[model samples]
Target: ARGLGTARLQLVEFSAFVEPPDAVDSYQRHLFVHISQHPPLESVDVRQIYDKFPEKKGGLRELYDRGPPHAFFLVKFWADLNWGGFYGVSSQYESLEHMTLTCSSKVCSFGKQVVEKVETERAQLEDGRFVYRLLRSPMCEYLVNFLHKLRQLPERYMMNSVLENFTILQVVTNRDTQELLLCTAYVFEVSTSERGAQHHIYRLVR
Candidate 1:
């Protein structure tokens, strides 16, 4: 499939300054458009710059690229290969307006867990809520496999492998300031089809 590790596409991310509060939404919207139209990669993995992609080319003149106004900037690596990884500093802006990260199960067997964890964490951070639940379903292949093996299958059977949706709600309060943090709910869902498996993640900060 596509020759293992060939890079089909690439992307470069540059940061700029944007006004605070009122400008958050506008800034994010601009980035969303830019990232969407740029190119679609096999996958995307973003981390911190200091920790990853540490090689410095020259200076701002060589590294920086013009983009929408923002307070900070970083290089983004967009590649259409088996592995699509990214590294950069977290946005300087503290007030996150909106963000989304999506991945396909085809990328990895555990992609569902990765996507769900990210969605859950982002939602809790945005809403300051916490929640935990025990999952039980026929769609969870790992769970189903364990159960089937334990029961001693007399004949071969097909158990539909699917991803079970997971979510968490979390909250925090400042005792000294007597300030309350709004509860946030994170959403994660999984879907399977003849085509492939898919996962979705969405978050909003108020």
Candidate 2:
């Protein structure tokens, strides 16, 4: 029962969402699927990160304080194009036979990668030379951490068999000052040669 007043000079503090997902012993990571190699590459449009791509690149990343799980990193590689994003989910069976069964024919033709671990290192230091190379400016923590997470991705995979080969991209990032981060693509459109097949994105959440 006091005087009514409006709070001015508001000093709102937004916490850094650096709490990467608490990964587990179980299998990790998932893939944003597409029947064609093009969708994964042309989904999200990054206006800042990698802006000078010659191939009309496309990508998706999860940003904001609240974001995709910090566990298994869902990475979309470029076969003929590139899709950028990440996801985390416990592998129920985490079985090759399971994915193997899902393999063959249509499944094999699509580029899906199931990974177990994505831990390495890169050069995203605050006082490093690479940061200058990445943006020609002071290193942004979000970009560095994003790349760190991206680099942590399998770095080696082939869930779909058409290309049954190693990773198309591989690199790591390390920040001198530890921190967190995505201009993210939350919607993706995929049209394949197979009329019966279409790529769908479903994330478990509120």
Candidate 3:
């Protein structure tokens, strides 16, 4: 149960409902939605028909298949600085709220710069907490891995209050091709008390 903590998440799958001139509802296209504690990385196969479809014959028809395949979403939960990994369960809440996330200048060679950039970028993404429009799949797993690594950072405790604010660190992508440069790390928080306020924390590299 080291990595197991209680967290609430909403997972949904949306059917594109794109009709190919002559298509049935059963054949309707669909996409997946995963709102978990962090981004997901499970590989979902590109539909055989979509992947193998002859490009020449494929036009707007390809849009249906090429569209975003999954929603890349995550929530920052409390971490165990002593255990050196994710330790606390993030409350299950999908609605975006006013939050503050602070990356530290403790371990990484580029800690200060990294944290600043992440913070600045996240601030611009906030817009009155309106339901976010875009959904990404490939980046989903990367985000998950990113959160997993961040949880291991010994500095997480020091940055605890800052982490509580932001539910996710949003990433930008290509309008045509959704691609992201994901940089992630792992940290752990060790605790001696089953119910104490203080704990040991450290960072590790893989």
Provide TM-scores for the models.
0.19, 0.18, 0.19
Q: Which residue ranges in model 2 land beyond 4 Å of their true spot? A: 1-63, 66-117, 124-176, 181-186, 192-206
The CA lDDT at 64 in model 1 is 20
lDDT, model 2, position 13:
14
Pairing residues by index, what is the TM-score of model 2?
Answer: 0.18
Candidate 3: tens digits of C-alpha lDDT, residues 59-149: 2124333433232221222332222111111112122433222221111111121222222112223354412222321222333444456
Off by over 4 Å in 1: 1-84, 87-163, 190-206
Q: Compared with the true structure, what per-residue lDDT tens digits does model 1 show for residues 44-134? A: 2222222222223321122223211111122121111110111121111111323221211111122122212121112123353221211
Best by lDDT: 3
TM match of model 3 to true structure: 0.19
The 0-to-1 C-alpha lDDT of every candidate, in the order given, reads 0.21, 0.22, 0.26
Q: Where does candidate 3 stray beyond 4 Å? A: 1-72, 83-159, 165-176, 179-206
lDDT of 2 by residue, 81-107 (tens): 122222321111111110111100011
Residue 91 CA displacement from its true place in model 3, Å: 23
Better of 1 and 2 by TM-score: 1
Show the lowest summed lDDT stretch of 10 residues, model 1: 78-87
Instruction: Identify the superior model by lDDT, candidate 1 or candidate 3.
Output: 3
